[PDB]
Amino acid sequence: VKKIPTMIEGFDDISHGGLPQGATTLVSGTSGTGKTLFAVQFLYNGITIFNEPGIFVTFEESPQDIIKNALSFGWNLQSLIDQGKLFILDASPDPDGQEVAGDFDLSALIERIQYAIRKYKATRVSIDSVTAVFQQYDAASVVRREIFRLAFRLAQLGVTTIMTTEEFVSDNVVILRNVLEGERRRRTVEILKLRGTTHMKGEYPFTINNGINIFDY
Amino acid sequence: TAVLKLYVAGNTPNSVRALKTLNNILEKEFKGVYALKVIDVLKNPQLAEEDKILATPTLAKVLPPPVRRIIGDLSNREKVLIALRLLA
Ligand SMILES: Nc1ncnc2c1ncn2[C@@H]1O[C@H](COP(=O)(O)OP(=O)(O)O)[C@@H](O)[C@H]1O
C-alpha cells in the first residue's frame, strides 16, 4: 500500500509513510480539535514541498475565513491561489436555505469537484466537513449516497483525499482529541485504522505551532 | 422578461422530468412571464461553479435580482406553481 507523505511533523512517522495514496482518509474529532488545520496543512505541504496542486472543498467556512485563518501559521494561501496551485471550492450553504420541490441529488457538486481536479491538475483534495453537508439537507439519504459516489469518483481520478468529520464508511481513520486538563489543553492524535497496512497504535500528543506538531513516538 | 435558469444533468431521469414539467408550466399557467435558459452541468460544470450550484436539478430565477432557488425534479407541481408566482 503506497502512501503519500504529509510532512506534518511526526505524522508520517506514526502512520509509517503518510496517507494511503489515491484513497480517502477520514479525520474525525469534536469541535476545536484541529480537523481544519490538518486539512489545510495537507494541501499546503502538498503544494509548497511537492508541487502537488490541491483542492479545498468547504461546506461550511467561507473561503475568506479559511484564508485569513491560515495566516497565523505563516501560510499565504492567497499566493498559492493566485499562482493556480490551490483552489478553494465554495460549497457553503446559500443564506436563503434550500427550497425542495421534488427529488434531487448532488450531481452539480460532484461535477464541479471533478472539473476542478482536471483544471488545476490536483492530486490532493480536502473536504471540510462531511458533517456540514448533512446539516445543509433534510435528506440524509441523498447525502449519504452522494458522499459514497464522490469518494468513488475521487479514487477513480487517483487523488488522495481527507474528509473531515465531527455517515461515511472508511478503512482509513484518524482521530483528533482535545482534553481540558485543569486549565490546560491536552491534544492528541490517534491513527485508528489504516487500509490493511502498518501503523503505530494509540494516542500521541501534539501541539499547534506553525502546523500540527506530533511528538513522543 | 425575467430569466430562469434550469441546471440539469444531461438526460438523467430527474432532469428529464424537471424540464418536461417546467416547459409545460411555462407554456400554460405562466405563458408570458419568464425566459428559460437550460444549463447542462455535465457539459458545463464551470458554469455550475460560477453560479454556485450543488443540487441537481436546480431552478433559479436569476434576472431581475435577487436570485432565488428551488431544487428538485419539480414533481411537486403546486409547490412549483406557487413558487413561480411569488418570484414573478
Ligand atoms: N492562531 C491559532 N493558534 C493555534 N491554534 C489555532 C489558531 N487558529 C486556529 N487554531 C486551531 O485550529 C482548529 C480547527 O479546528 P476544528 O474545529 O476541528 O476545524 P473547524 O475550523 O473546521 O471547525 C481550531 O479549532 C483551533 O484550535
Curated annotation (Swiss-Prot), chain A:
Superkingdom, taxonomy of origin: Bacteria
Region (B-loop, required to bind KaiB and SasA): 98-105
GO terms for biological process, alphabetical: circadian rhythm; protein autophosphorylation; regulation of circadian rhythm; regulation of DNA-templated transcription
Residues binding ATP 1: S31, G32, T33, G34, K35, T36, L37, S72, K193, L194, R195, T197, H199
Keyword terms: ATP-binding, Biological rhythms, Hydrolase, Kinase, Magnesium, Metal-binding, Nucleotide-binding, Phosphoprotein, Repeat, Serine/threonine-protein kinase, Transcription, Transcription regulation, Transferase
Catalytic residue positions: E60
Keyword rRNA-binding: no
Phenotype when changing K35H: KM for ATP is 13 uM, reduced hexamerization. KM for ATP is 3.4 mM, very little hexamerization
Entry text on domains: In the homohexamer the 2 domains (called CI and CII) self-associate to each form a 'donut' layer. The KaiC CI domain mediates interaction with KaiB, CikA and SasA. ATP hydrolysis by the CI domain causes a conformational change that allows KaiB binding. The 2 domains communicate to control ATPase activity. In the homohexamer the 2 domains (called CI and CII) self-associate to each form a 'donut' layer; the compactness and local conformation of the domains varies over the cell cycle and impacts function. CII has the autokinase and autophosphatase activities, both CI and CII have (weak) ATPase activity; CI has the clock pacemaker role.
Subunit and partners: Homohexamer resembling 2 stacked donuts rings with a central pore nearly blocked on one side; hexamerization is dependent on ATP-binding. Binds 2 ATP per monomer, at the subunit interface on each ring. The KaiABC complex composition changes during the circadian cycle to control KaiC phosphorylation. Complexes KaiC(6), KaiA(2-4):KaiC(6), KaiB(6):KaiC(6) and KaiC(6):KaiB(6):KaiA(12) are among the most important forms, many form cooperatively. Interacts with SasA, probably as 1 SasA trimer:1 KaiC homohexamer, has highest affinity for unphosphorylated SasA.
Family: Belongs to the KaiC family.
Name of the protein in its database record: Circadian clock oscillator protein KaiC
Gene for this chain: kaiC
Complete-protein stretch covered: 19 to 247 of 518
From Swiss-Prot, chain B:
Effect of K52A: Loss of circadian rhythm
pH dependence, entry free text: Stable from pH 4.0 to 10.
GO biological process: circadian rhythm
Effect of E27A: No longer binds CikA
Keywords: Biological rhythms
Temperature dependence: Stable from 4 to 40 degrees Celsius.
Similarity comment text for this entry: Belongs to the KaiB family.
Function comment: Key component of the KaiABC oscillator complex, which constitutes the main circadian regulator in cyanobacteria. Its composition changes during the circadian cycle to control KaiC phosphorylation. KaiA stimulates KaiC autophosphorylation, while KaiB sequesters KaiA, leading to KaiC autodephosphorylation. KaiA binding to KaiC yields KaiA(2-4):KaiC(6) complexes which stimulate KaiC autophosphorylation. Phospho-Ser-431 KaiC accumulation triggers binding of KaiB to form the KaiB(6):KaiC(6) complex, leading to changes in the output regulators CikA and SasA. A metamorphic protein which reversibly switches between an inactive tetrameric fold and a rare, thioredoxin-like monomeric fold (KaiB(fs)). KaiB(fs) binds phospho-KaiC, KaiA and CikA. KaiA and CikA compete for binding to KaiB(fs), and KaiB(fs) and SasA compete for binding to KaiC, thus the clock oscillator and output signal pathway are tightly coupled.
Annotated domain remarks: Has 2 forms, fold switches to a thioredoxin-like fold (KaiB(fs)) when bound to KaiC, KaiA or CikA. The KaiB(fs) form binds faster to KaiC than its alternate form, so less fully phosphorylated KaiC forms; the KaiB(fs) form activates signaling through CikA and inhibits signaling through SasA. The C-terminal region may confer species specificity; C-terminal hybrids do not all rescue deletions in S.elongatus PCC 7942.
Quaternary assembly: Undergoes a major conformational rearrangment; in the free state forms homotetramers with 2 dimers. When bound to the CI domain of KaiC, KaiA or CikA switches to a monomeric thioredoxin-fold (KaiB(fs)). The KaiABC complex composition changes during the circadian cycle to control KaiC phosphorylation. Complexes KaiC(6), KaiA(2-4):KaiC(6), KaiB(6):KaiC(6) and KaiC(6):KaiB(6):KaiA(12) are among the most important forms, many form cooperatively. Binds to KaiA; 1 KaiB(fs) binds to the KaiA homodimer. Binds to the B-loop in the CI domain of KaiC; SasA and KaiB compete to bind to the CI domain.
Protein's name in the database: Circadian clock oscillator protein KaiB
Organism of provenance: Thermosynechococcus vestitus (strain NIES-2133 / IAM M-273 / BP-1)
Lineage: Bacteria, Bacillati, Cyanobacteriota, Cyanophyceae, Acaryochloridales
